[PDB]
Paper text:
The Very Low-Density Lipoprotein Receptor (VLDLR) is an entry receptor for the prototypic alphavirus Semliki Forest Virus (SFV). The mature alphavirus virion is approximately 70 nanometers in diameter and has T = 4 icosahedral symmetry. Trimers of E1-E2 heterodimers are organized into 80 trimeric spikes on the virion surface. The LBD is comprised of eight cysteine-rich complement-type repeats, also known as LA domains (LA1 to LA8), which contribute to binding with SFV.
To elucidate the precise mechanism of SFV-VLDLR recognition, the single LA repeats (LA2-Fc, LA3-Fc, or LA5-Fc) in complex with the native SFV virion and SFV virion alone were firstly reconstructed by cryo-EM. To increase the resolution, a block-based reconstruction algorithm was applied, which improved the resolutions of SFV virion, SFV-LA3-Fc, and SFV-LA5-Fc to 3.02 Å, 3.45 Å, and 3.55 Å, respectively. In the structure of LA3-SFV, LA3 binds to the DIII domain of each E1 protein at both the 5’ and 2’ symmetry axis regions. What sets LA3 apart from LA5 is the length of the loop between the N-terminal strands which in LA3 is two residues longer than in LA5. We found that LA3 engages with the beta-sheet of E1-DIII through its EF-like motif, creating an interaction area of 323 Å2. The residues R114, E117, Q126, D135, E137, D139, and H116 on LA3 form hydrogen bonds and salt bridges with E1’s K347, K345, N325, E292, and D327. Meanwhile, LA3’s P129 and W132 engage in weak hydrophobic interactions with E1’s G326. As expected, most single mutations (E117A, P129S, W132A, D135A, E137A, and D139A) in LA3 resulted in a loss of SFV binding ability, while R114A and Q126A reduced the LA3 binding affinity to the virus. Analysis of the fully saturated LA-bound structures revealed that LA3 can bind independently at site-1-3 and site-1’-3’, satisfying the conditions for simultaneous binding at all six sites.
Author numbering:
A (entry chain F): 1 to 438
B (entry chain G): 196 to 244
C (entry chain I): 267 to 422
The structure:
Amino acid sequence: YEHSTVMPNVVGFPYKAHIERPGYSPLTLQMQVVETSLEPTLNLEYITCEYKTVVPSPYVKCCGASECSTKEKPDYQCKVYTGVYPFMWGGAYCFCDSENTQLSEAYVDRSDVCRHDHASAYKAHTASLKAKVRVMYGNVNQTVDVYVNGDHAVTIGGTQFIFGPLSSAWTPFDNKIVVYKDEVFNQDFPPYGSGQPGRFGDIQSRTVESNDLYANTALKLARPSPGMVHVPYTQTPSGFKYWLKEKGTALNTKAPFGCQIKTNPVRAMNCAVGNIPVSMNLPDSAFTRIVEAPTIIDLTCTVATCTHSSDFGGVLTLTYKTDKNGDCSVHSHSNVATLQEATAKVKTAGKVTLHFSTASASPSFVVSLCSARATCSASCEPPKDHIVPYAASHSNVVFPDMSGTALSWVQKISGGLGAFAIGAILVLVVVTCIGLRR
Amino acid sequence: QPGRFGDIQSRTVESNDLYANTALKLARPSPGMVHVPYTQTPSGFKYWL
Amino acid sequence: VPMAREPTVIHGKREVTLHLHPDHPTLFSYRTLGEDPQYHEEWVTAAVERTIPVPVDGMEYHWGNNDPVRLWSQLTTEGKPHGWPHQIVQYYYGLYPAATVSAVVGMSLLALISIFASCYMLVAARSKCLTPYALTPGAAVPWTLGILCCAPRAHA
Ligand SMILES: *[C@@H]1O[C@H](CO)[C@@H](O[C@@H]2O[C@H](CO)[C@@H](O[C@@H]3O[C@H](CO)[C@@H](O)[C@H](O)[C@@H]3O)[C@H](O)[C@H]2NC(C)=O)[C@H](O)[C@H]1NC(C)=O
Ligand SMILES: *[C@@H]1O[C@H](CO)[C@@H](O[C@@H]2O[C@H](CO)[C@@H](O[C@@H]3O[C@H](CO)[C@@H](O)[C@H](O)[C@@H]3O)[C@H](O)[C@H]2NC(C)=O)[C@H](O)[C@H]1NC(C)=O
């Protein structure tokens, strides 16, 4: 028996589905989203880490001149300085007074621990959603793992469930993502090959194991001081360290809809938005023949107390007449009030009580016990406590019933004014028709 | 109230009775240790000072 | 690493007053877990006191090394529902204090327009039904004189 429904994408919401087969007794399923996981799709762009400037020892040519040679190294710098007269601890070598030349060489290289402490630049698109839903009904419990898209059917006790695609298409990750350890940042990194000194991605490596490197840190060399051998140089500080110091905020503590960001793999878990359509296919053995189920007649609904609070703050009573005792499948046919249970023991006494949760001043919903029906209306008082540590258990609908107190007052006032207006119109029409009849 | 002036009070200096409300809560000791942990809101007299 | 003490919470109307007692600089951060969050994070050093908003959507705050704690507000107000008309307005003004005023104003102007139109219709009808008899020195038909309050009560 094919059936379909739509359930909210809220973790912990006690969604209950009512299935009515005309030839059998009604059935009530309880589905609950224990956990979700929004996995995006990534394409690694490059890897950034601190750099390490290596300066080989200078070559001083005594009584001669040296020529610089170019090399294919990331951000290579080389110069030759004429007229140096170096010194050492014991005495000044390069015995020539002024015919000497020093060659200075330096270049940038990837750091030592770049494979342990590095930031990755990604591109995120077309996120895929996952869930973990607990389904219980009849006498069968059990939690299953599903993909939330209409391409995965899981069997729970002989019943096939398909969870349709999410209603919305909202993902907290922007187009470009930077991931560092256990933090995700919505950043706009420069493209490969066009980094800038002193900021994020001054040196860019296509992969942690890639040999190629692109470094741009404005390395420069300066003439050595007289009577020294030190190879002076100047260089703009690392961009990775200064990114660490002033990266600013994150996505873990900034994501909307109250959903945590994680890493390895990147995913936004337990993130409440949209609706999850559901498709089912139940076998003939799940239902019970109408002969076995008890009969319920003369169903009357009365509300003892009501309070539109987050917890189940309402109490409901049902009176009936029955031939034999057994079980029934209670349900509320409007989302104004969310019941607590999906089964109730009916007995020859003729009284049973149910608890519901509502968020409106005056609710109006129809409740069914097995095959019976009954309409309930009530007046509800606000709660006294200001803040609670648990989420709401109602669907958050606040418009009161048309038979409520406020709407009854509006109806009475509008009816009086309309009666006055109709009287005025009738008097004017009578006067005009009397004038015309002559 | 804990953390503010007069979190502990006594009728007089030599009075035997004492009222204390400092939110003293015990915690489970770590495995393989004997240290009886706890947590407590700091003194209200010092923060008043 | 150490875990800092839990703060003291005081509940308000969609607000939490939060007493913070650190020993060494700890990080305090919170966010409102709705559609548009309210972001904030700070390095609390000395004993301070914070007020943080808690809408109906809820919010979470992260104090030091402790696990984040979530708090949800509740649909509470100050008016009296199912009472006199001036109390239902208070009840629905404590909740959503931006649409109740607009709805009340709209209904009031609609009522005023309707009553003014009805009064205008009555006045126009009386003018139509009284002027033909006001062009001749004739009797006012005491039967009709009593029914409709015309200008001459008894003078002709
Ligand atoms: C031992 O020390 C002497 C210096 O007292 C060194 O002699 C120097 O040798 C270099 C090249 O070997 C000379 O440089 C060039 O020499 C040419 C010669 O025509 C000249 O035209 C250039 O302008 C330039 O000066 C340098 O002049 C010369 N100095 C002298 C002779 O006073 C000698 O090389 C040292 N021994 C060794 C093994 O290097
Ligand atoms: C369907 O299966 C689930 C999971 O087996 C059932 O939920 C489980 O209910 C039991 C009974 O309360 C929980 O055990 C108790 O949990 C409390 C929680 O504080 C703990 O203090 C007790 O010491 C005891 O362990 C159990 O935790 C809970 N499982 C989960 C994952 O929440 C559920 O009741 C079953 N459905 C029906 C209709 O029985």
